[PDB]
Scaffold this active site. Structure first.
Site, short mmCIF file in Angstrom:
data_model
loop_
_atom_site.label_atom_id
_atom_site.label_comp_id
_atom_site.label_asym_id
_atom_site.label_seq_id
_atom_site.Cartn_x
_atom_site.Cartn_y
_atom_site.Cartn_z
N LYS A 34 37.83 29.68 36.28
CA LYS A 34 38.45 30.24 35.09
C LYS A 34 39.91 29.77 35.10
O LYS A 34 40.59 29.99 36.08
CB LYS A 34 38.42 31.77 35.01
N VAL A 65 42.84 30.58 33.36
CA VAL A 65 43.96 31.50 33.21
C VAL A 65 43.43 32.92 33.20
O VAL A 65 42.44 33.17 32.52
CB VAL A 65 44.70 31.24 31.89
N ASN A 66 44.08 33.82 33.93
CA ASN A 66 43.59 35.19 33.93
C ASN A 66 44.69 36.13 34.39
O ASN A 66 45.30 35.92 35.44
CB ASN A 66 42.40 35.34 34.89
N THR A 67 44.83 37.26 33.69
CA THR A 67 45.83 38.24 34.06
C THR A 67 45.18 39.54 34.61
O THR A 67 44.20 40.03 34.06
CB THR A 67 46.69 38.61 32.86
N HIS A 86 40.16 42.01 34.47
CA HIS A 86 41.58 42.29 34.24
C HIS A 86 42.14 43.54 34.92
O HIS A 86 43.36 43.70 34.91
CB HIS A 86 41.91 42.34 32.75
N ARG A 120 36.34 44.11 34.86
CA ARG A 120 36.13 43.22 36.00
C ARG A 120 37.15 42.09 36.03
O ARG A 120 37.65 41.72 37.09
CB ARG A 120 34.72 42.60 35.96
N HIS A 148 39.19 42.36 25.29
CA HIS A 148 39.74 41.03 25.49
C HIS A 148 41.21 41.15 25.82
O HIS A 148 41.88 42.03 25.29
CB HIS A 148 39.54 40.20 24.21
N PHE A 149 41.68 40.32 26.75
CA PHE A 149 43.10 40.23 27.09
C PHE A 149 43.71 39.08 26.28
O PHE A 149 43.33 37.92 26.51
CB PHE A 149 43.31 40.01 28.59
N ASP A 150 44.66 39.36 25.40
CA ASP A 150 45.15 38.33 24.49
C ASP A 150 46.38 37.63 25.06
O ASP A 150 46.47 36.40 24.96
CB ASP A 150 45.36 38.85 23.08
N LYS A 180 33.15 43.85 31.27
CA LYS A 180 33.66 42.54 31.62
C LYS A 180 35.19 42.53 31.59
O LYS A 180 35.80 41.90 32.44
CB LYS A 180 33.15 41.48 30.65
CL LIG Z 1 32.81 36.79 26.55
#
Ligand SMILES: [Cl-]
EC number: 4.6.1.18
Length: 124
Positions: A41, A43-45, A12, A10, A119-121, A7
């Site tokens: 979604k 916010v996403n980088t 990031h 996919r 996870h992208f922090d 995930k």
């Molecule tokens: Cl999750």
């Protein structure tokens, strides 16, 4: 049953381009990565580096995560990234995004064996 690691990839990874070249990148990419299926979604980088370079961050500078856990890591160097944030007008299902291309450090949380980003922090 997407793994957490899958995930992360996919949502990031975008090793296919060196940088966003148009202001439409986020609209394009948020759709295609299926990040607007059920909801926009917010916010996403996306990271424009090799998967190996991003995984390598799990061996770099250990920092606290926003949530106070301590399995986060900051990249020693800047990375080409694109920040995607939903515009205030955006309304599902006509999701709309502001694209911002940048060179910043990334911070990711890492887990598992192998110990990989899940996870992208933040970016710095
Ligand atoms: Cl999750």
């Amino acid at each position: 049953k997407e793994t957490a690691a899958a995930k992360f990839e996919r949502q990031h990874m975008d090793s296919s381009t060196s940088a966003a070249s148009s202001s439409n990148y986020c609209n394009q990419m948020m759709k295609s990565r299926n990040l607007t299926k059920d909801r926009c979604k917010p916010v996403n980088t996306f990271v424009h580096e090799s998967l190996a370079d991003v995984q390598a961050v799990c061996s770099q500078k250990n920092v606290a995560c926003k949530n106070g856990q301590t399995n986060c890591y900051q990249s020693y160097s800047t990375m080409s990234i694109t920040d995607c944030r939903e515009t205030g007008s955006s309304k599902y299902p006509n999701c709309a995004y502001k694209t911002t291309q940048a060179n910043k450090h990334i911070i990711v949380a890492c887990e598992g064996n192998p110990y990989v980003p899940v996870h992208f922090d933040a970016s710095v």
